[PDB]
Design a protein around this ligand. Structure first.
Ligand code: ZN
Ligand code: ZN
Ligand code: ZN
Lengths: 35, 227
């Protein structure tokens, strides 16, 4: 399981994207890859 | 023979997530020749795309069947008909709320003097959901047929995704101090609106007093009221 979190001060855009990412990857069955 | 892909470098596309079935806004960064595989040895291309809302995923290699021209044409309510295969908004986690963009076959349409009802069979990752009640009946997109129309290379058609703010319904022509700038209510420059680590409200750097010329380089940030 991979979890992305943009460092530093949070922006509206980063939070808008986090909410979409939560739905996609934590609730609906999307799979984060990372290497 | 020379590569002659349907979609070109820099073209605006939709790219499908094969795990959960949704179509996401992306841009083509490269087109490469796919090594034919046994037994049929069909020729194909791989699209390398970058996703608008998932830049942290970097450049992602896509099967050609999972890329198409960015949706741009809305099928108005009166033109919708049973049997049409369209791209529409649905949220399997919360069907009464906005979610993501999926292929769907319209399966029923009803209209009374008080209500408009649309049902569709929504295609997810590995299965379908039959007879989903579709909330966003005025945001049903035609699926572009390959070759028809011009490539979208600028001036992209914007879609809303994810659950919407209950104050403003994410209406781009409305201000909202709850989900956008707490001071002016404006949606513009979301990359330059700071989020208070206490109250979680948004603030344009240029609406603060004193205004800030850029996003601060700190671990955290708190608004005037929470300081
Ligand atoms: Zn709002
Ligand atoms: Zn503002
Ligand atoms: Zn605050």
């Amino acid at each position: 399981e991979w979890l992305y979190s943009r460092r530093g001060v949070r922006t509206l855009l980063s939070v808008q994207r986090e909410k979409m990412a939560r739905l996609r990857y934590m609730l609906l069955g999307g799979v984060r890859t990372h290497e | 023979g020379p590569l002659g892909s349907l979609y070109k470098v820099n073209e605006y596309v939709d790219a499908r997530d094969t795990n959960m079935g949704a179509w996401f806004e992306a841009q083509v960064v490269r087109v490469t020749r796919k090594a034919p595989s046994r037994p049929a040895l069909e020729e194909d291309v791989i699209y390398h795309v970058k996703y608008d809302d998932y830049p942290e995923n970097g450049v992602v290699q896509m099967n050609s069947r999972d890329v198409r021209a960015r949706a741009r044409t809305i099928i108005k309510w009166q033109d919708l008909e049973v049997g049409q295969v369209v791209m529409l908004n649905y949220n399997p986690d919360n069907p009464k709320e906005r979610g993501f963009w999926y292929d769907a076959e319209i399966s029923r349409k009803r209209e009374t003097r008080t209500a408009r009802e649309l049902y569709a069979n929504v295609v997810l990752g590995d299965d379908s959901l039959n007879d989903c009640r579709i909330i966003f009946v005025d945001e049903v997109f035609k699926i572009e047929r390959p070759g028809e129309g011009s490539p979208m290379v600028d001036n992209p058609m914007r879609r809303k995704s994810g659950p919407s703010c209950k104050h403003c319904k994410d209406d781009v022509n409305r201000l909202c101090r709850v989900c956008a700038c707490h001071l002016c209510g404006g949606r513009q420059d979301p990359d330059k609106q700071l989020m208070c680590d206490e109250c979680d409200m948004a603030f344009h750097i240029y609406c603060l007093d004193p205004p800030l010329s850029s996003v601060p380089s700190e671990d955290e940030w708190y608004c005037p009221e929470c300081r």
